[PDB]
Design an enzyme around this catalytic site. Structure first.
Site, short mmCIF file in Angstrom:
data_model
loop_
_atom_site.label_atom_id
_atom_site.label_comp_id
_atom_site.label_asym_id
_atom_site.label_seq_id
_atom_site.Cartn_x
_atom_site.Cartn_y
_atom_site.Cartn_z
N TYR A 14 23.58 -25.52 13.54
CA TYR A 14 23.44 -24.74 12.33
C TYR A 14 23.13 -25.64 11.13
O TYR A 14 22.23 -25.36 10.35
CB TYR A 14 24.79 -24.06 12.10
CG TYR A 14 24.94 -23.42 10.72
CD1 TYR A 14 25.45 -24.16 9.67
CD2 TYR A 14 24.57 -22.10 10.53
CE1 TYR A 14 25.59 -23.55 8.37
CE2 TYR A 14 24.72 -21.50 9.23
CZ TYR A 14 25.22 -22.25 8.21
OH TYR A 14 25.36 -21.68 6.99
N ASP A 38 29.66 -17.50 0.61
CA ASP A 38 29.41 -18.81 0.02
C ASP A 38 29.10 -18.64 -1.47
O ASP A 38 28.15 -17.93 -1.84
CB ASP A 38 28.21 -19.49 0.68
CG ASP A 38 27.52 -20.55 -0.17
OD1 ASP A 38 27.03 -20.27 -1.28
OD2 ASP A 38 27.49 -21.73 0.35
N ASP A 99 33.36 -25.05 5.92
CA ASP A 99 32.80 -23.84 6.50
C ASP A 99 33.76 -23.29 7.56
O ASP A 99 34.10 -23.99 8.51
CB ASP A 99 31.46 -24.11 7.17
CG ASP A 99 30.25 -23.48 6.48
OD1 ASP A 99 30.37 -22.47 5.77
OD2 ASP A 99 29.12 -24.07 6.70
#
Lengths: 125, 125
Positions: A14, A38, A99
């Site tokens: 990713y 985000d 993340d």
């Protein structure tokens, strides 16, 4: 119960795709009706449409993400920490957001939320 | 309200309460009906009973938790990373789980969850 190799690997692929600017792919990386957040509490998006909308408005900035710690893969979970290199207005800065991706079904990310603090950034020039 | 300054500070207080191994305190820290979800495995417990019960069975081990990275206070939730020093009768091991929980600016935590793994564990002598 989800493996760290598969999960972490996904996070890796990713990241690369991200630096590649592969929105379509990145989108295919996870579910199609997943929800991305985000940074945080900044209006989360949902659906390849939204996910793409955000990821796009994000990549809009010429930055380069890179791992500087590791990934925290667990129960269908994958919370890793990475750095983000970006410079604007003759001002360089490097963030280190985390993340947090949660896989469901078996290995399909339907939820993605990052975690960035104020002291998680390092400006300079 | 909500800030990373107050949030982080709270996180610090908690850690100390952790190292000190004060269930009564740590308990008095967050809500009384909060829910603990650490490390992982999809099995969160609510109430000072299940909470204390766990936190106790956990502290049961003579370990010493301490930060070695930073704290990510975001989304009215603090998500920091810390380590845990513990020896295995002659052996040595140090874990680096991630503490992520939500609360109200002041230390009003009603939900908390950690994220650990094998990679988070660092054996040694």
């Amino acid at each position: 119960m989800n493996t760290p190799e598969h999960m972490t690997a996904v996070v890796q692929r990713y990241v690369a795709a991200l630096n590649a600017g592969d929105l379509d792919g990145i989108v295919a990386l996870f579910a199609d009706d997943a929800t991305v957040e985000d940074p945080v509490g900044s209006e989360p998006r949902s659906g390849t449409a939204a996910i793409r909308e955000f990821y796009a408005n994000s990549l809009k900035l010429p930055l380069a993400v890179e791992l500087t710690q590791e990934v925290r893969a667990v129960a269908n979970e994958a919370a890793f920490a990475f750095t983000v290199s970006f410079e604007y207005q003759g001002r360089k800065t490097v963030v280190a957001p985390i993340d947090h991706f949660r896989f469901n079904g078996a290995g399909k990310v339907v939820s993605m939320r990052a975690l960035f603090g104020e002291k998680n950034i390092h400006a300079g020039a």
